[PDB]
Structure formats: C-alpha cells, structure tokens
C-alpha cells in the first residue's frame, strides 16, 4: 500500500464513502475509530476490537507521554507492538487533553508540549496518522479570543508540518492532518481552512466542536465549515459522537469520527440500540432474556441476555464492562457500515430518515 | 453420558488420574476448577475459561442467592444458560461464606440457610455437583468444639442427602458430595469419614482446611485424612490452593481443587510462572519484553509482554485484569495437565520433585 491515499468511491449530497490506504492497512470511510486512553481500548483485546469491524484506533497521546512514556514505548518497539494492534493508529496531538503555562512556544503543565515535541512523541509512538498540535478553543469564545487562538493554531500547524517533514522516516511512512479552529464563527473557520490548505495536509479535522455547544450549533457550524476544506481529502470531526451526531455529520461531509461515548457510556450501563440507548442497570431489565439489541450481529447479542449483563453491571463485575463495550463498539461499526452501504447505493438520505424515526 | 461415573485410569502412590463423566461433560482428574463469585469467572468470557482447559467451574452460591437470587436464576433458565457455560458446574453449599444466628436448623444472617434450603438453591441454580451443607469449623479449634461442629455437620450431611434424594429431577441429573470435618484431629476425621461413607455420597470433600493452618499442617492432616475416604470416589480439597499446595495434595490423594488465588492474586499483579510467582507491578518489569512465563502456551504469553501487562496493571486498566487472569488460569490448567500425564506415565513423584526444585 502507499503511505497515504484517499479515494472516494461514491457520493450523495455532501456525504462520501471511500477508502484511505496506508502502509498498515485500509480504512473504510466514513470511519468510526475506537479510543484507547492508555494503550488499550478499554476492556477489549485488540482482536476483539478488530472483530467488531474497526479499521483504525485512536491512541491517547496525553496519557501515553505520561504513562508509560513516549521514549519508553519507542524502546519497546512502538505502540503497535506494545499493545498488539498491527493496523493504523491515529494519535491526537495532546493539545486538548492538557488544557498549565501557555505561551507561543507551547504548553507546560502539571512537563512541556510544543508543536515540535508533540510531533516527536507521535513519532516515538509509531503513529500512522499524526495530528497537528493545536489549541482547542474553549466554548463559548468571544470573537477576539477565538481569533487569537485560531491564529496561534495556524502558526502551530506550520510548525507541525515542518517538524513532521524534517523527520524522514515519519514523513515517508505516516500521514499528517491539520486541524481547523475558529469556534462557531464562519469568517474565522474560513481563514483557518485557507491557512491549512495553503500549508497542505493529508487530511483535515474540524476541531473546536464537541466542547459543549449542542447538536444544533455543531451542525450549523459544520454546514459552513466542512465545505471550506479540500474536498479530495478526508474530513475528521474530533470528539463526535453519539449515533445521531454521526449520521448528521456524515450528511454534512465528515469522513471520520472518534467518541469515548460507546466505551465510557458502556461501562456506566448505557447500551446503544436501534431504538435508542438503554441503561441496562434499570430494574426493568432484571429478567429480560432478550439481547441488548434485537438486530445486532455482535457476539454479545448472540450469547447473553440483558438480564445477565444487568446483573454483571449491577455487581461491578469486569465481564459486564467487557460485554457492554464490545456491544457498543460493534453497534457503532454496524452503524458505519449501514452508512457506507447506503451512500454507495444512493439511499443515505432515506437511511438517515429511517434511522432517526426509529432511534427517537 | 451417565449422571455420574468416576473412573481411575492410573495411579502412583496415593495419586490418581482419571475421569468423572456427567451429563454435561467429562472432568479430567486431578482437576482445577476456576471460581465464579457472581455468575462469572472474573474478567473472562466462558469461552476463554474453556480455552484454558477448564472442564468444570465453581458457582459461588452465597453470592448468588443474594445477587441475583436463586429463584430469579431459575426463572431465567438456570445458571448454565444465564452465564453461558454449558459444562459441569459445582456449587458450594453456602455453609462457609456465610460464616449470623446459628442453630441446629441452620443459619440466619445479615436471610436463612438450612441443609434443605441450600440443596434447594443449588437445584434452582441447576448445579451439576451439589455440596452438602456443612459448618466449616474455625481454626484453631479445641477438640470439644471441633467435635461438636463435626457432629452437627454429619447430621446436616444426612439432611442434605435426604433433601437431594427427595427431589427427583435433582437426584437423577446431579451429583452430591459430602464434606469431611474434624479440624486437625485424626479421630474426628475418622468419625467424619465413617459417618459420610455410611450415608453414601458421589464424592467426598475434605473440608475445614485452607483456613489459616499452614502447608505443613494441612499436609499432615491430609496424610491421615484422605485415606479414610472411599478410594473409589473423588476427593475434593476445598479452597486449595497455590501450585505447590496442589502438587502435594495430589501426592496425598486429592482429585479436585478450587482456589480464588489465580483470579484474585492476578488482578493484584501476581502472575504464576514455573520459576515461581512474580508481581508484575514491580518496576523491574517495566521494560521486560518477555512473556509472563517462558514456556506457557497461553494466548497471553503468545501475544503480550510483561512490560505491557505491567503498564496495564499499574494504570488500573481492565485489560490488565483480563490478561493476568487468563494467564493464571491457563497456568493452573497446564499444571494439572502435567500432573495428569505424569501420573499416567508413572513419573509423578519425579515431576513433583522437578516442579519444586524450579518453583522454589
Ligand atoms: N486536537 C484536538 N482534539 C480535540 C478533541 C480530542 C479528540 C481525541 C482524539 C484522539 C484521542 C483522544 C482524543 C476533542 N474532543 C472533543 N472535542 C474535541 C476537540 C478537539 C480539538 O479541537 N483538537
Ligand atoms: N463448604 C465448605 N467450603 C469451604 C470453602 C469454600 C470453597 C468454595 C467452593 C466453591 C465456591 C466457593 C467457595 C473453603 N475455602 C477455604 N477453605 C474452605 C473450607 C470449606 C469447607 O470446609 N466447607
Ligand atoms: Zn450487540
Ligand atoms: Zn501464559
């Protein structure tokens, strides 16, 4: 495979489906990327993560540079070998999870991170998709503050580009995505997009959302922001999200997603189903012999009842977390698969309508 | 298969290897039985428990009659269906884990348990091997107190026998083991053995050990106690134990074992190896790329390093508990397999010697 190749196989409106080819494998888009926060997708072996249909996972940099350390993972052969995942890994740049003394050089915190060091750490980890080091602007933000932050992010985006390119092994084997900022303001999003395209990246994330603004506002910002990005490159919406957020963002041109919700919200008792989320701890499930979801093809739904998983989560048993997480990540992969197939077949707007009617 | 058939294929000294055939499967002896404390072997899917080589698991009654409840599990189709384990299950009688108002009728506690109710609960759970309801005499015990307790246990053993036999479905499909008491006193062990043999059971446990007496004392008691039991029936040492305790008890005629050590001690960071236990949290493992144990055939040792599992346990990650538990239970199964093969081949005393030289 090439270092990086994105091909669009089909479109419907602003939605696209395709593939990203990279040395360690192919990524089907639109993609949902399970999150590891300490070199593990919580409660799952990597073979299980793969079996659910994941093509790529997200490595949580901030936690790794602290524990176990970037230099240490490198000495041990890199993150892929360390955790036993041999397919692509996207790493965030750390410029969110830290936010501390902030300067134009970078951030020091309760340690230092700069564009250069972030890119280096992602290199030590053996990341396949490297994120530029950005500032994720707090919400709400005044226009002046959103602009100052965006501007700094764009300067940092150029420093990221040049650090990456200045490391031959990384430049030849990994990909680099830039991150658009600008809060909810169209003119700053446009300036950000322009600056990023001028620098040039392998992919473009929409950053600064999923920071408490609410679905209507996020979709509004996506309406004008995603078309500002190069069409022929992948669009990653960072930190999104719930099933419904995913469908509406694909409708707005996003190709890639990460959420901690399916893992997080699963160990908490929330299970996703096509009729909406359920909280399996609810007493109503205590004698319910049905699987978590009636159509789901995952191994959990093949083998265990709601009543058992209810008992497990209520009891604080680790297998409860294992099964809820497997199910939720499988659910998400099956959602992505239905989205891809529906776009390929030119019926995604109908799918999205049918999905929402039932989910709500 | 029959309801219950124990066949001895080979012997060496007091050690025996063979098979127990029951309707839900065959149990290779000497046997190690992983423990579930709430209808789960902690951190493992049943398919994983099986893959490690377990032929039978132990259902933790005390926890189940409280959570989720015996009647509830019965309504849901029984423990096998509920937890997804279709092979034999041995259940303890609850007469240990409770110890509260104690009487000749049974015990009430912070609920009631009597010989009759214990047998009924094990029935509701769908247990394959039912344990008699006993009193596990505290250690140390004076001779008078050990005798009083033993005597009560034997009366309860007759009540257990008769409750079991009085329930046709249970009597036809399950097995019943009696439990010898008598603390560390030979004459009370003998009285207990006689009383139990007179009643007659499918198997005989040695109870009242693993209660803080220490290996030398436990082995001393086993030296005289196990020969008192019917030779042609299985001998179960309850609550034992460490790898070394297992080898010496097989040398003394025990066929079956349960310990919470491999599960318990695994999530705590203790890993069993043929060179003895290691605590994987120790800093010395932080960059150790070797598997937990150098010969172990388990999937954990095939795929992950000490350094990674060290990181996981240090980080409190659930996959750390999953991998340490899989390894430790696999280790134990491989121990049992080496014990069985060595007895079958008439070299178990050499195995035991070689095992100890290296383990210590
Ligand atoms: N770099 C960056 N990250 C964000 C994350 C973390 C996503 C992440 C990816 C991979 C691993 C961990 C975390 C956000 N989460 C919610 N909203 C978010 C916004 C941003 C952002 O604007 N920039
Ligand atoms: N009934 C009984 N149980 C014991 C257990 C629990 C084993 C058990 C089996 C199956 C499930 C849970 C617990 C002991 N543990 C350590 N020493 C023990 C002694 C006894 C005993 O004398 N009688
Ligand atoms: Zn499912
Ligand atoms: Zn192993």
Curated annotation (Swiss-Prot), chains A, B:
Binding residues annotated for Zn(2+), in chain numbering: 296, 298, 301, 327
Amino-acid positions noted as binding substrate in the UniProt annotation, renumbered to this chain: 92-96, 134, 181, 208
EC number: 2.4.2.29
Region named RNA binding: 239-245, 263-267
Pfam families noted in UniProt: TGT (PF01702)
Superkingdom of origin organism: Bacteria
A GO term, aspect molecular function: metal ion binding
The keyword tRNA processing is assigned to this record: yes
Active site: 92 (proton acceptor), 258 (nucleophile)
Listed Gene3D superfamilies: Queuine tRNA-ribosyltransferase-like (3.20.20.105)
Co-factor note (free text): Binds 1 zinc ion per subunit.
Function: Catalyzes the base-exchange of a guanine (G) residue with the queuine precursor 7-aminomethyl-7-deazaguanine (PreQ1) at position 34 (anticodon wobble position) in tRNAs with GU(N) anticodons (tRNA-Asp, -Asn, -His and -Tyr). Catalysis occurs through a double-displacement mechanism. The nucleophile active site attacks the C1' of nucleotide 34 to detach the guanine base from the RNA, forming a covalent enzyme-RNA intermediate. The proton acceptor active site deprotonates the incoming PreQ1, allowing a nucleophilic attack on the C1' of the ribose to form the product.
Family statement: Belongs to the queuine tRNA-ribosyltransferase family.
HAMAP family xrefs: Q_tRNA_Tgt
Protein name: Queuine tRNA-ribosyltransferase
Record organism: Zymomonas mobilis subsp. mobilis (strain ATCC 31821 / ZM4 / CP4)
């Amino acid at each position: 495979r090439p270092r990086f190749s994105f091909s669009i196989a089909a479109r419907e409106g602003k939605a696209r489906t395709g593939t990203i080819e990279m040395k360690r494998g192919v990524i089907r888009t639109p993609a949902f990327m399970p999150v590891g926060t300490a070199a593990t997708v919580k409660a799952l072996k990597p073979e299980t993560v793969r079996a659910t249909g994941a093509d790529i996972i997200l490595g949580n940099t901030y936690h790794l540079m602290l524990r176990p350390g970037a230099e240490r993972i490198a000495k041990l052969g890199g993150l892929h070998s360390f955790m036993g995942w041999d397919r692509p890994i996207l790493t965030d740049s750390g410029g969110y999870q830290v936010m501390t003394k902030q300067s134009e050089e970078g951030v020091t915190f309760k340690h230092m991170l700069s564009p250069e060091r972030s890119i280096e750490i992602q290199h030590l980890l053996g990341s396949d998709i490297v994120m530029a080091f950005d500032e994720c602007t707090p919400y709400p933000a005044t226009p002046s503050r959103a602009a100052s932050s965006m501007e700094r992010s764009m300067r940092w985006a150029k420093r990221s580009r040049d650090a990456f390119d200045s490391r031959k092994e990384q430049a030849e084997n990994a990909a680099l995505f830039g991150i658009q900022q600008g809060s909810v303001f169209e003119n700053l999003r446009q300036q950000s997009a322009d600056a990023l395209a001028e620098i040039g990246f392998d992919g473009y994330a929409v950053g600064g959302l999923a920071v408490g603004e609410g679905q209507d506002e996020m979709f509004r910002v996506l309406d004008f922001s995603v078309p500002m990005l190069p069409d022929d490159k992948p669009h990653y919406l960072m930190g999104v999200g719930k099933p419904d957020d995913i469908v509406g963002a694909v409708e707005r041109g996003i190709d890639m997603f990460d959420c901690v919700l399916p893992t997080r919200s699963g160990r908490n008792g929330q299970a996703f189903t096509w009729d909406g989320p359920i909280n399996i701890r609810n007493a109503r499930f205590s004698e319910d012999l049905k699987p978590l979801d009636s159509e789901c093809h995952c191994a959990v739904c093949q083998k265990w009842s709601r009543a058992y998983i209810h008992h497990l989560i209520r009891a604080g048993e680790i297998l409860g977390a294992m099964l809820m997480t497997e199910h939720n990540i499988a659910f998400y992969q099956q959602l992505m698969q239905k989205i891809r197939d529906s776009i390929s077949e030119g019926r995604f707007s109908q799918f999205a309508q049918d999905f929402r009617a039932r989910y709500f």
